[PDB]
Design a protein around this ligand. Structure first.
Ligand code: BCO
Ligand code: AMP
Length: 533
């Protein structure tokens, strides 16, 4: 059960509120999207322009391309304004948007198009070849829209059609619970599932969290993220636009901490969001060379924020980092808001929609100080912000419900004030530098190589990245004579070539056998335990 309005749409109910206010002269034209490429190109839309231009977006998707309410549109773009325009476009036209990363390889993309039966893909120069390799294998795929300075046979020209489109679109009266986005999400075993979010679970939820960061209507916030991750829709797009604030985007084509540091010291960025690894890379630089007195709010999600990282950032910049915690399925689940005291090593308290608790094997709420499983009350009322379920897979959804609670799959402890401390993933999912990696994905990749007869992929402790993907590999005997170091690199290269490179095995150990259950299932937990300390 849920307690929402019957209808909601971020675009008509939030974005267009800010456009009208400018139109009505009740607010001056206020910056919404400020994009830079680092090479001297900058573009800015105020809220009217953002509105007008994304209505153009919607008319491209629904008029030119004929996409219809409920159709699914894959979106694989780098950090260019058109991602924001397209996403808004989908929201207006009632299209289900499915972001992914430009790190994807052809098989990654095939898997998503076939699984989702997408009717459209909106891509850039990065993956176009990749897509063309597999498009003929996707019978539901009708529309291929390319965001590029070049045109290409078989691709519609987004930037041209956009410019040709009307600035008036009639926004669809989308329902609160109606599908708006699918985000593919990795699991403890098997390949990625389709996590479906509603118009409310993203848009209403973000409206209600808006401000936790410390952002005000007149500030600029820079979220540093691949456009594919849910971080992007919630913090780069919805958080600021809920408040009428401006969102900053740097193409940041190579993730360069020095460019980050120069950007912070050259623009009036008030808030920044990024995974802890971003703050760690930044700390490896010489921050004395930079000053950014305008920056006041630094937040993080995706990984545990190390007390030492928190400490050093404070020492080196005079600023706190306020942590938050969540997953694709739940969004922002816990946070340290601007006014809360920071407890090093704790990720904050429940998002305001959520009853978050530590729960036992039978689903009972545990007392403070007791380790258990972290859970969001979803019965009898399902809170605004929880996703709608795994598409086509209600069993897997049912499988993460225990009693009245949805299970995050993380262990934790709750203190006396309701602050949560993360105590580890309870399953085989790997978290490496803020990525959520399914072990089967990396295993299948390795198994394609003739050298690998059997493999198990588990997490390995790493100072810098927290945790890295490690493979245990049983070798085809022919290969026992190869140089190990050479063979390791060959295998690493192989994984990187067939699936998004971020998941490759940074460590590989060759072994004669993998431990198993009497039923013949590999005991990753066993390997994982031995690998830690
Ligand atoms: C409510 C929940 C919200 C959320 O938290 S959503 C989750 C948020 N998570 C994140 O944002 C993840 C953030 N972390 C990162 O982005 C980091 O990985 C970070 C900061 C960019 C550092 O990245 P890098 O080490 O440069 O690269 P990477 O860690 O992504 O690993 C990729 C490996 O492969 C390479 N690669 C990348 N693109 C490639 C390409 N197109 N072709 C061939 N190779 C490529 C890359 O060099 C790296 O390999 P290597 O370490 O150099 O051997
Ligand atoms: N603040 C944090 N501390 C520790 N782990 C986190 C934090 N935020 C996110 N995670 C991990 O990342 C997962 C979410 O991955 P994703 O679904 O890609 O957002 C969670 O289930 C946690 O395992």
């Amino acid at each position: 059960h849920q307690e929402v309005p019957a209808k909601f749409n971020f675009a008509s109910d939030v974005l267009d509120h800010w456009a009208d206010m400018e139109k009505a002269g009740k607010r001056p034209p206020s910056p919404a999207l400020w994009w830079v490429n680092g090479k001297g190109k900058e573009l800015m839309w105020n809220f009217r322009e953002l509105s007008e231009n994304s209505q153009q977006a919607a008319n491209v998707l629904s008029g030119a391309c004929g996409l219809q309410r409920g159709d699914r549109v894959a979106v694989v773009l780098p950090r260019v304004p058109e991602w924001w325009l397209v996403i808004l476009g989908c929201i207006r036209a009632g299209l289900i948007f499915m972001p992914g990363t430009i790190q994807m390889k052809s098989t990654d993309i095939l898997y998503r198009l076939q699984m989702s039966k997408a009717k459209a893909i909106v891509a850039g120069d990065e993956v176009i070849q990749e897509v063309d390799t597999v498009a003929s294998e996707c019978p539901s795929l009708r529309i291929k829209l390319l965001v590029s300075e070049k045109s290409c046979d078989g691709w519609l020209n987004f930037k041209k059609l956009l410019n040709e489109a009307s600035t008036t679109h009639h926004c669809v009266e989308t329902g609160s619970q109606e599908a708006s986005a699918i985000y593919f999400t990795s699991g403890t075993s098997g390949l990625p599932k389709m996590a479906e979010h509603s118009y409310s679970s993203l848009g209403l939820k973000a409206k209600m969290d808006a401000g936790w960061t410390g952002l005000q209507a007149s500030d600029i916030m820079w979220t540093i993220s691949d456009t594919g991750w849910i971080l992007n829709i919630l913090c780069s797009l919805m958080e600021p636009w809920a408040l009428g604030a401006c969102t900053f985007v740097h193409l940041l084509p190579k993730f360069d901490p020095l460019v980050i540091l120069k950007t912070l010291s050259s623009y009036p960025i008030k808030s920044m969001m990024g995974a802890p690894i971003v703050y760690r890379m930044l700390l490896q630089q010489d921050l004395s060379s930079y000053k950014f007195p305008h920056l006041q709010n630094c937040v993080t999600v995706g990984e545990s924020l190390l007390p030492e990282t928190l400490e050093n950032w404070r020492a080196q910049t005079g600023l706190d980092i306020r942590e938050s915690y969540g997953q694709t399925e739940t969004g922002l689940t816990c946070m340290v808001s601007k006014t809360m005291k920071i407890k090093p090593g704790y990720m904050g308290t429940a998002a305001s929609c959520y009853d978050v608790q530590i729960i036992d094997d039978k689903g009972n709420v545990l007392p403070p100080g007791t380790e258990g499983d972290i859970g969001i009350r979803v019965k009898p009322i399902r809170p605004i912000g929880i996703f709608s379920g795994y598409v086509d897979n209600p069993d897997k959804t049912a499988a993460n419900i225990r009693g009245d609670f949805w299970l995050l799959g993380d262990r934790g402890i709750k203190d006396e004030d309701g602050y949560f401390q993360f105590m580890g993933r309870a399953d085989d999912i790997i978290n490496s530098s803020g990525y959520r990696i399914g072990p089967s994905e990396v295993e299948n990749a390795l198994m394609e190589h003739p050298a690998v007869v059997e493999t198990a992929v588990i997490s390995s402790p790493d100072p810098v990245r927290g945790e890295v993907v490690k493979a245990f590999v049983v070798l085809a005997s022919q290969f026992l004579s190869h140089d190990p170091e050479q063979l390791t690199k060959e295998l690493q290269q192989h994984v990187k070539s067939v699936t998004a490179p971020y998941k490759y095995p940074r460590k590989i150990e060759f072994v004669l056998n993998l431990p198993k259950t009497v039923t013949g299932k590999i005991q990753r937990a066993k390997l994982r335990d031995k690998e830690w300390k």
